[model samples]
Structures are given as structure tokens and as C-alpha cells.
Target: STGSATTTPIDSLDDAYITPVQIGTPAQTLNLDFDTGSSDLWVFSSETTASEVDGQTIYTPSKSTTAKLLSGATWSISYGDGSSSSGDVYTDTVSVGGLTVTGQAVESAKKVSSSFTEDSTIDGLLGLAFSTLNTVSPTQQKTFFDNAKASLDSPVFTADLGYHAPGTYNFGFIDTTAYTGSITYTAVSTKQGFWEWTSTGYAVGSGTFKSTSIDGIADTGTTLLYLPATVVSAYWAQVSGAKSSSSVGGYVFPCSATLPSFTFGVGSARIVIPGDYIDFGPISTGSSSCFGGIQSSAGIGINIFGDVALKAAFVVFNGATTPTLGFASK
Candidate 1:
């Protein structure tokens, strides 16, 4: 049982920025939040007021005439940051990319607050996180992937994210063209749902990476990694004099000394993150701190291996084939 371990509660700190998925037959192009923590696909209804639709898009269900509310059903979701949203339930035809599924269940939140409305860019979360976190009860729901599953032809789905662009998350059958080498597949533990799988271990710089791997579920909703304190400290120590900066908080170090590369080995695939990833982020608008890829989230029980880490590797979840998560170079 001590071979290799991955962190749990890994989804606690994830970034919810994904691609735009088209819904319905003709393809209604809509920006979507790619969340890996929760499942269930729903879009904002155009029925909401313009003021309420600050940063999110509204789906004009009436335009299609096929959209229908769940009637008596009510829904609400709360986030770790203390933000929340609530509304009614509904059903409609949905699509992703060009894939379509009929009679899909969704949420119809008539009363969403600004906290969720302001910072959000896409229409609504497509929730690639987990099937269990679906807001709509299974009796009345179906996800975008679920709809595409039956007809997608491909036994698995893969995400190919553009490195330079940072947010270009793509989907389709696993595109081997995007990877530098072969695909690595990890067997997932079925006991956990949203919190699925675990990392075998990690390696940094010339120092042998101590076995800090813990069983954790990979999620797209989180933005940062939440590892054990000891592991975090060990990672930073290998930074070769990379001093930790306070501006970005936690543990961000200057890689000017000896920028080290970190590798995460899960199954046979190894996800390597260059030192630049530690320095990734827009330079401060005026005079603030530039963010680093790996920051220490000490005191946190869960290790949310985030965007900085995921952007470099092409991830595959074998929802169609089995419960395996495949990792490949990008």
C-alpha cells in the first residue's frame, strides 16, 4: 500500500477555465467552464436579466422551443471560496463541439449572484469533473460527455491544451499527434468518485524525488496544488536557492539561480514541468508580483495539482473504455 501515493482533496484549488462547447444540433457555440470536481452540464438561460448576466452567457431556451424546466425541482451549489448559486432544474437538447445528445438534463438558475457572475467568462460550467457532482438528480439528468459518449465513436476522450495560449483545452479521441511520445495510462481506484486516482511520485532537479505520491483525483476545476507540508517543503528545498517570494504568497521562489524541472510519474507517463512554468503568469499590470507555477499550499490536506502542471501534459480520462486516466506529452 506504500508503493506510491497521491494527495487527496486535490480539487480544492483548481482553475475553472476551459473551452467553449456548442450545444444542440446546429451547434450553438457557447463558452464553458471545464470543471473536473463536479459533473452535470447547464447553461445560463437568456431569460435572466441583462444586469444579472454580467460575465456569463445566457441560453435562450425559448428560441429552441425544446428547452423545458424541471418544474418543481430546485438547485443550489456552494464553492470553497464562499461563493454560491441557486436556481431551478430543466431539460433540453445539448451538444459539445459538434457532438449532440437528446433530452439532456440541466439546471435553470434564475437567481445567480454577482460573485459567480462577475469573474466567470464562459456561459456555464460543462462540469467534466465528475459524474456524481451533477446538480440534476440522475433520474432527470445527462451530461455533455454522457450525451457524446454513445455516439462519439472513440472509446476515450482526451484534452489537448495549447501551451503558448494557456487556455486552449481541446477534446476528441486522444490525438497522438499532440504528444511527443507514447501515452501513459494509470489505473484508477474505484472507491472514490470525484476524488479519483493518485500520483505515483514526483522528481525535481538533480535531487531524487522522494515518494510523495498520494491517491488523488485529477480535476480541472482547481487552479493550484495542495500537497502535504513536508512534500511541499522538500520541493522548494530542491529549488537550488530559489528564494520564496511573499507577493504570490504560499511558496513561490525565484528560479534565476538554478531553475529545476519537476516530473510527476503516474503509471508509466511522467509529467515534466519546466522552471518557466514556475514563472508563468502575466507580469503585474503596474507593479505587483509575477506568479509561479508551483506554490506551497501548506496546511491544506488536499493536493490540487493545478493548471501550471496540467498545461504541459495531455490528459485522458477513460470514461468510455474504463476508469483509467491517461497522461501523455503535449
Candidate 2:
């Protein structure tokens, strides 16, 4: 089977993207973040306390005849940003786009951290990472894609993330019409349940392309780009007055400063990030200083190619036996 879903950028181009999904009988629709960094389909549900619900929508399993409790099973997950959620588990029919998966595990959040509870628009998260990353206890849960792959014509999905535009997440097949030019493929190391790969090197603002190796993961859940502190420092050095600010967190500079372009090497291909995208809006409304879209991944352990980087190209997440990644100019 083949399916495709439209993903809408939340707030601005630098934030996360949301897609429509249906769970349980009669299809309870939810607007969820299609996160490629984690593997738990958790939702703000009836299990969550009323006070904690805030302005977010909640999923009510009791209203779905197809929902069944996973006896004694629970799930908990934490992100690098300190966001977290935990709850019991349920088995139900879950569908994305027009593709359906029976007996899919759905984690209902009984507790959530401020990051989630405070976000009034996001109702839940639909994880697209390998099922090995699932947080369910007793037995790790499989993602909807995992269950649906067997019936798919091809074991692949494409992420067409756009800048200030509506993008798409296509399942089971690639739409050649969605991208232009040839795709450059790279091997992925999924040992840690992440789509991780190494870049030959990088350069700032058309300078000499350095051959420094960078190991990073392509994460849709993350909003900005993160690299080694040294790499971030070198890039900022090219921008006058850009500095690391404890008050703003990460680096900040005058909003009017002309930023340098960032480039990442993938085999023979070089993916270039436009300088304009580097300024991640102002630190605060009416503030002259602007936060940088690229920062240090020092404490985070691994560099992250977030939305700022992903939006520059069309990405192919191939789940074949080799589990390779393909990139192309949009």
C-alpha cells in the first residue's frame, strides 16, 4: 500500500511540523508532531489530569470501541531538551494518511512536563524513528510504520520538509515529482535507534571547505541545527558581534547582521544552508538581538541536523536492509 500525508509547519519555518493521524474505532483524529528522533506515539489523553490538560486537545479512548488496554504496560520518554511524557499503553487501529495498521500501540500520557503541557496546539507526538527506540515497558512497542511496512509496495518513506511552505511525508513509495536532481545516498548507522551518519566536513560562507568529520543525526523533532562547539564558534567568527550569550542561551547577534552560509559534505555532495535561515528570529519581541539557528551540541552528545538543515533538501529515509539515507535538491 502507498500513502502520503501533508505536514504543516507550526508557528514558523524554524519550529516543528504537525501531521494528521487517526486512532481507534471511528477514527479519532489528532494533530501530532511527526518526530523522527523518538519512537513513542504518545498523546495528551483522558488519562492526563484536567489541570494539566490546559488548552491542548485530549484523546478519549473510552469513546473508541476498538481501543484495548495493554494490561500492566507503561511508557515514558525524555528528550535532550528536558521535555518528557509518561503513561499507560493501549492497542488500537492507528492510521496515517490512508494507510492503516491494526493493533498499533498508543501511549496515553498520564503525566507530561511543562514543555508539553504548555504547548496548547500540539496534541501529541507520532514517532517515526526505528521501533527499537520505543519506551514501552515489559515489551518495546513497534511504530505504525513498522507494522504497515509488510503490506507496503516498498519499504521506504520520504520527508519533504519545506521552508515557510507546506511539506509532505510520503509512505511506502517515493514521489519523483516532489524533488529535482539526482539523489546522493549515504550509509546510516542505526545502532542507537537513530538515523546517524558522518559528514566528510563543512565550511562557512564559501570559505575553504574543511575536511573535518562530523557525526550527526537527522532529527525532525529538533527545531535548530546543532554541531560541535568548535564548528559553531568558527561559523560565528565570520559574523561580526555574534557571541554566546548565557542570557539568551546559545549564540546571538544583531538582527541586521549578514549571516554566513553553512555547508555540510556528504560523500561528493555538499548541502548548503542559506545564511538568512541562520537567524532564528529575535530573542524577544522588539529585541534587536536575534538567536542563532545553529548552536553547540556539546552536552547533547550528538550533533543534530534539525529543521533548519532538513528544510534545505528533500530527504529519503530508506528502511531497506541497508537502511541508507538519500538527499536531493528540491
Candidate 3:
């Protein structure tokens, strides 16, 4: 079987993508972030305290006849940004796009952090990474993609994110119409549960391509691209009056500055990120400085090819016996 879903940017900065999902017997639709950086399919639910619920939609397990409790099971997760959520687990019939999964594990949020309450866009996250990253106790639960892989036309799923536009998530068969040129394949190292890989290198603007291999993860959960200071410095150097200010946690420059495009290699193919994509909006409502989409990984202490990078190409998460990743320019 094959299925597809639509994801829209939750904010003006393209901060995150929110996809609507159907949960339970009567189909309670919840807007969630399809996060490749995580492994837990958690949600804001009735179990969460009213104070923490805020403006997000809640998933009520008790309202669903198909919901069943996972006895003694508990889950917890803390993100890199210091926000967190935790609670018990349940098994329910969850569907995405036109695809359905019976007895899918759904983590309920009994408590949520302040950061989550402030964001009214997403109710929770649907993890698409390896199940080994699951936070469930006693026995780990598989991700929605993992459970659906067996019944899919092909054991694969693709992510086609966009800039200021609706994105697509495809399961089973690849949507050939979504991309151009042949896809470049790379062996995925699911080490530590991330869809990690090494890139051939990068190029600053229209300059020569760098040959150094940069190791990173394709993370849809992250909003920006993070690379080593060695590479990111080169990028900022080319910008006029671009300053390395970690005060706000990254490189910032004059709002009117003409930004340079960023390029990264996937095998032999090079994906170029438009200069405008690098302009991550202004630092403040009418500030003269703007935040950069590409920043030093040293700030976060890890390299990540976040939405800023993924939006430049079509990414495939091939869940084969020997997992591999495929990238194609669209």
C-alpha cells in the first residue's frame, strides 16, 4: 500500500512543519510534527495538566474505543533545547494520510514544558527514526514507519519539505513526480538511532567545492543547518558584516545584506540552498540584524542537516534489510 500526507509550515520563519494525523476509532485529527530526529510518537492528551495544555489539541485515549493501555509502560523525553514531556503509553489505531496502523503505540503527555505551551502550532511529534531510539520502558516500541513498512508497496518513505510552502511525506512507493534527476544513494549508519551519514563536502556560494566529509543527521525536527565551525566560518566569512554572535546562539548579519547560497554534496550530486533560504528572518520585529539558517555545530555541539538542508532536496528513508538513504534534487 502507498500513502501521502501534507505538511505545512507552522510559522513565518518555517520554524516547523505540522502534519494532520487521524487517531482512534472516530478519527480525532491532531496536528503533529513528523520528526526524523526522534523515535517516540507522543502527543498532548487529556492526561496532560490543564495548565500545560495551553492552545494545543489533545489526544483523548479514553474517548477512543480502540485505545488500550500498555500496562506499566512509561515514557519520557528531553530535547536539545531543554524542553521536555513525559507520561504513560497506549496502543491505538492511528492513521496518517491514507495509511492505517493497528495497535500503534502512542505516548501520552502527563506533563509538558513551558516552551511547548508557548507554541500553539503543534500538539506533538510523530517520530520517523529507528525504533532503537524509542524511550518506552521495559520493552521498546517501534515507530509508525517501522510497523507500516511490512505492508507497504516498498519498505521506504520520503520527505519533501519546502520553503514557505506545503511539503509532502510519502510512504511505500516513491513519488517520481516530486523530484528531478536520478537519486544519489548513500549507506545509512543508524548508529545511535539517527539516520546519520557523511556528506562529500560543501561549497560557499558559487566558489569551489570543499572535499572534506561532514558527518551529520537528516533531522526534520530541527529548524536550521548546523556544521563544524571550520565549515560554517567559511560561510560567514563571505558575508559582509556577518558576526559570530553566540549571544543569540548563532551568526547574525545586517538584514539588508545580500546572502550567499550554501551547497552540500551527497555523493557526487551537489544540492544548493538559495541565499534567501539562508536569511532566517530578522533578529527582532524590526531589527536591523537577521539570524542565519546555517550556524556552527559547536553551538549545539553536533552537526545536523536540518530543514534548511533537507528542503533543498527530496530525501528517502529506505528501511530495507540494509538501510540506505537516497537524495535527489527537486
Candidate 4:
């Protein structure tokens, strides 16, 4: 109830998300992070060197009888954090839920950046951020969601993000049963490969925060919510006994209790991060706690509402409709 997020019903046309699919034999149905920010789905293939990839689920295409390869095309992607991965592009039959699509493009990277190798769970990223930003396109600008949308019962797809826990972020089908209304959205500015934005402000319960200037790409790829220093410190103060115990990053806390429930309003839509998830255990070097929500990254160049926020609710990234974001209960 508190830690779950579900999607809307399956309609006729394809929309923002794709369903979790079974990749290979014994049938490991993996839920992928379909990102449009880049055009690549580099699952850890059997051919990958164990030392190269951080931690990811390896999908053996040969194990799947229907899998195919789209030879010749090579793929690569780099992130602002200096993470990168690359490999050859191959086409294979992919299935989401019960809907199977033939000739889906997939990447087989022989290597990934060191940071990606450290995180490991990153296994693969399905770039559904946008087809326009594709490096291989104009020629093959299509995305996984774009390819899978037609097969879905609806023209839409939804995402709830929690790879570590089951049903944490359920994709496919926006449950009209829980949807109260539509979410407020803004047109996606296609300047950077990522979706950049300035948070107008924040409102939680009746508390309204002053306008703070910050800029960065709206990303679902990151883990912690990175924010301006002042906001992070102030937000941390709300947590019981949260303290900055060192010069390096991280705030320390007792870490024995549930966190306070909080939400940040973006225009008309609001994002909620539950209280229990606030403390990310503790810093290895310092006694300070690693917060789960937005942290002070004032001097840092960008701000990110990472998976910490997405784990709280259902977020709809409708890039097809002027690149807007919608939020709803699970």
C-alpha cells in the first residue's frame, strides 16, 4: 500500500512506457528502465566480460528460441556523470506482458564505464527518453516503447520504478481505478539530450518553499535526489537528528525510525516520497546519513529527482505529447 506503484489500464495505442518482459530461458522476465534520453538497450549479454559491466542481468538471446539479431549497427551512450556503455546493435523478438513484437533492436555492449560496473543493477537501460535524440536515427530513431506501443492494448504505457523490490514500480496499464485526474505538464525542451528544467518551487502539505534556482535533466536513471545545497540542508533538518557530519557528501541521522511523508509540487502535479525511505543507511567515511530525498548539491552543476522520488508513486513521462510528466497514486 505505502511502497507500491501501478499503471493505468491497457488501451489501444502506445504511450509512455513498456511492460516487463521475459528475456531468456528458464524465463527471467526482467523489468527494464526504458529511457528515451538515449537510444540503447544494452543488456549484459553472455559474451560480455564479467569485469566490464557493473551489475546487470545477463540475457542470453540464444536461450530464447525467438531471438534474432540486427547485424552491422553499433550503439553507444554516455551520461553526464561520465558513465558510458557501447556494443553492437542486434534485433530480437521482445515480449511485454503477453504482447510479443518481432525484430526489436537490442544492444550487446562488450564494455561499460567503471561507475556502471560498480552499480551492477543497472544491467541495461532501454532508452525511451525520445527517438529524436537518437544518435543512430533519422535512420533507426525508434525506441522500445515506440516499437512496443502498437502491440499494447492501449496507445499508452506507464512506469513505476523499483528494480530492487517486486511490484515496486509496475509498468504497463495506467489503472483508471486509481487515477483521480490528469497531471500538469510542460513542453519538453529538446536542447540537451536530457530533459532540463528549473523547479518553479515546492509545496508539501500546506508548506510552500521559496523559489530556488536549479537546473538539470529530469532523469529516472539516477538513485538519490540531488538538489541545491540550501534546499537539501533545510529538507534534511526536517528529519529527526539528521546532521552533516563531514565535508564530503551525506547527512547523518539516527536511522532507526520511519521518515516523514513529504511531497514536492511541480506546477499542478505533485511527487511524494514516503517517510520510511528517507535515510539511506549511513556514510562509510562519516557518521552522517545518506538521505533518500533531494540533497544539497548547491555547488554541484545540476539537480536530479532520482529514483528516490519515483519509488513513491506512478510517474508518466508522455514525451509523445510535447514531453510532459504526469504523476498519480499506485
Q: Which candidate is the best by lDDT?
A: 3
Better of 1 and 3 by TM-score: 3
Q: Flag the better candidate by lDDT, 2 or 4.
A: 2
Backbone clashes in model 1: 22
lDDT of every predicted structure (CA atoms): 0.60, 0.89, 0.93, 0.57
* lDDT at residue 65 of model 4 (Cα atoms): 69
- Cα error, residue 199 of model 2, in Å, equals 1.4
Estimate, for each residue in 144-259, the C-alpha lDDT of model 2 and write its tens digit.
Answer: 77888889989988888878788999999988888788888998999999889888889999899999789999888899999999999999999989999987789999998999
- Tell me which of candidates 2 and 4 scores higher on TM-score: 2
Candidate achieving the largest TM-score: 3
Candidate 1 lDDT, 137-203, residue by residue in tens: 4254555565556565564566544434533344346555767887888877545456377788887
Clashes of each: 22, 0, 0, 36
Better of 3 and 4 by lDDT: 3
Candidate 3 per-residue lDDT over residues 1-330, each given as its tens digit: 888999999988899999999999898899999999999999999999899988999999999999999999999999888999999999999899999999999999999999988899899999998999999998899999999999999999999998999999999989889999989999789887999989999999999998998989999999999999999999999999999886777899999899999999999998889998888888888899999999888857679999999998999999999999899999
Candidate 4 Cα RMSD after full superposition onto the native fold (Å): 6.7
Candidate 1 off by > 4 Å:
1-16, 24-27, 47-51, 113-115, 137-140, 166-172, 238-249, 254-259, 280-285, 296-300
Candidate 1, residue 304: Cα displacement in angstroms equals 2.2
For model 2 the local lDDT of residue 87 reads 93
